[PDB]
Chains A and B, each alone.
Chain A
Amino acid sequence: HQRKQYFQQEKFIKLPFENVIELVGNRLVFLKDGYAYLQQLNLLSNEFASKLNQELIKTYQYLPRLNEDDRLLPILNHLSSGYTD
């Protein structure tokens, strides 16, 4: 019943299967007449994660050009290591 309720509110995306081949191979997406009906939030989440990871690597490449300013690095170090009568 919870799944049916969630499905009733869930929108879907119509697009070519050629852009959703990875989902197609696992039978995660319903197909008709060459179109794929995307469980969309998982797709948007995964593309966001991958894009974010690529941008993270880009910023890690360009960071030795950012270490020159004094006001930023202590803050970045503190919020990086903060993860640890």
Chain B
Amino acid sequence: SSDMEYYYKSLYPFKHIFNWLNHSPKPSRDMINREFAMAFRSGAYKRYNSFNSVQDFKAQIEKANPDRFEIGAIYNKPPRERDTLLKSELKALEKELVFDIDMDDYDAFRTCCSGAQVCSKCWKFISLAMKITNTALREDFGYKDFIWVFSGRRGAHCWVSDKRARALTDVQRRNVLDYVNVIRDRNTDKRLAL
């Protein structure tokens, strides 16, 4: 807990996350009305959190001291005010389009690591995953502002922040997913027969 508090105190870049999440130097509705979720060491999970500035971001995150926090979408109303609203009022409007890639689906083809282990040798699977995915987004969808972030142990998260990608609806996101997801059946005991 002390290390995590210190990390949120002096090392995590709150300003850069706020600037990329707001998509404007001046704070805007992309940040005040965006949902945040904090996962605690005790296992508690609080949703609908939101921040109005970098300083409020810092104070709230340092005070709560969560082990990790996850980013939500942009809503029409401030999520932190959820208890004052009906359930039907909080409508999701925009979220950066994401992919999740993990080593879990490649354990049947790697011998350099068994179970929850990872090294440079097995990371080539994930590297080819980003290569193919990035080629697809750039050439076929025309997206430009996408960045990959290490998942912490053996995975990588994609974050497409293109203005077209943020505002895509659920069906359009599903269409892009099933476009990229050629291998819909992950079992190794049966022919794909693509």
**Contact status B140-A21, CB under 8 Å:** no
Contact of B13 with A by CB under 8 A? no
B142 touches A34 (CB 8 A): yes
- In the bound complex, residues from chain A placing their C-beta under 8 Å from that of B175 are 21, 24-25
CB atoms of B179 and A25 under 8 A apart: yes
Does more than half of chain B's interface fall in helix, strand or loop, or is it mixed?
A: helix
The interface on chain A, measured as residues whose beta carbon lies within 8 A of the other chain's beta carbons, has a size of 7
The answer to whether B141 and A34 touch across the interface, beta carbons within 8 angstroms, is: yes
Query: What residue of chain A has the Cβ atom nearest to residue B140's Cβ?
Result: A31
Who on chain A is nearest to B179 by CB? A24
Q: Is A85's beta carbon under 8 Å from chain B?
A: no
Which secondary structure characterizes the binding site on chain A?
helix
Residues of B in contact (CB 8 Å), total 9
With a cutoff of 8 Å between Cβ atoms, the chain A residues found around residue B171 in the complex are 21
Residues of chain A having any CB pair with chain B under 8 Å: 18, 21, 24-25, 31, 33-34
- Chain B hits for A25, CB < 8 A: 175, 178-179
- In whole Å, how far is A30's beta carbon from the nearest beta carbon of chain B? 11
B172 A18 Cβ-Cβ under 8 A: yes
B83 within 8 A of A: no
Chain B's closest residue to A27 (CB) is: B179
Query: In the assembly, what is the distance between CA of A76 and CA of B81, in Å?
Result: 58
The answer to whether residues A33 and B172 also contact, given A24-B179, A25-B178 and a CB cut-off of 8 A, is no
Q: Contact mask B173-189 → A, CB, 8 Å, 1/0?
A: 00100110000000000
Q: Which residues of B contact A18 (CB under 8 A)?
A: 172
**Which residue on chain A has the smallest CB distance to residue B143?**
A34
Q: Would you give the shortest CB distance from B43 to chain A, in whole angstroms?
A: 39
B134 to A: closest C-beta gap in Å: 15
- Whether B89 is near chain A, meaning CB under 8 Å from some CB there, is no
Are A33 and B179 within 8 A (Cβ)?
no
CB of B64, distance to nearest CB on chain A (Å) = 39
Q: List 16 A-B contacts (CB under 8 A).
A: A18-B172, A21-B171, A21-B172, A21-B175, A24-B175, A24-B179, A25-B175, A25-B178, A25-B179, A31-B140, A33-B139, A33-B140, A33-B142, A34-B140, A34-B141, A34-B142
